[PDB]
Ligand binder design. Structure first.
Ligand SMILES: [Zn+2]
Ligand SMILES: [Zn+2]
Lengths: 143, 144
């Protein structure tokens, strides 16, 4: 039933851009900015951790090549127009289609493109230290 | 040389190190917007995504995937419950402050913390999409 798998299989049309042996990209037909692009692995998995590594390695090179296509790569200064790369995992994180997809979203002004809510907390070395200790312990056992 | 993220990689500025790779370096965000807000950076210094060599880009998302195992985010294989965002910002207007490419792995446990997504739908059309699609295809042919 997955609509992105249907896009890949040519059963739903799409404004196709770069296609790879592993990766498929196309214009978002519900964009939030002018050339809003989606980039998906051909391996169906709902979240990032469901994608094999060899599919994951292919995504950012394709995204970076798309920035050449959209000419976003002509601005090598922090000012002027910019862009975001965003991938969502779960309803609460704003994912609706349950197949991994990266958004390449040009940021031309404040009214359009991604709007970033950034609720940052103060630095607290004691809590970070305890969190680092716990995460390094989970890392040791992943290895 | 004047880049906090380069200095952090070299160990000249402190950091809470997590996974490191021949090509990638990751560590806790010390001004986090969610509990285990992690940063993931290529070791090569580029300001924007398009300034990073292909071989550094290929290694980033497998590291992010491995970090979702460290953070136990990989245990929820349903669209409900808690989630997470991967964000990368290019230029001041896109919310980028440090001019070394960094990816955010941000757990999404509730609505008050984590990434807040503003999503302003833009009125569009199959005519406009089609003409835009022809313009980008021409450019893709030149890139090739
Ligand atoms: Zn699918
Ligand atoms: Zn740097």
């Amino acid at each position: 039933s997955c609509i992105f798998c249907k896009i890949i299989k040519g059963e739903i049309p799409s404004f196709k851009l770069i296609e790879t042996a592993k990766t498929y990209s196309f214009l978002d037909i519900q964009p939030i900015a002018e050339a809003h692009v989606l980039i998906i692995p051909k391996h169906h998995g709902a979240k990032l951790h469901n994608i094999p590594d060899d599919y994951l390695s292919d995504i950012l090179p394709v995204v970076k090549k798309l920035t050449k296509v959209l000419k976003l790569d002509e601005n090598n200064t922090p000012e002027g127009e910019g862009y975001n790369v965003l991938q969502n995992n779960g309803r609460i994180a704003h994912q609706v289609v349950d197949h991994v997809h990266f958004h390449l979203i040009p940021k031309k002004d404040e009214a359009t493109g991604l709007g970033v809510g950034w609720p940052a907390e103060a630095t607290d070395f004691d809590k970070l230290g305890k969190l680092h200790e716990k995460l390094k312990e989970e890392l040791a056992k992943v290895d």
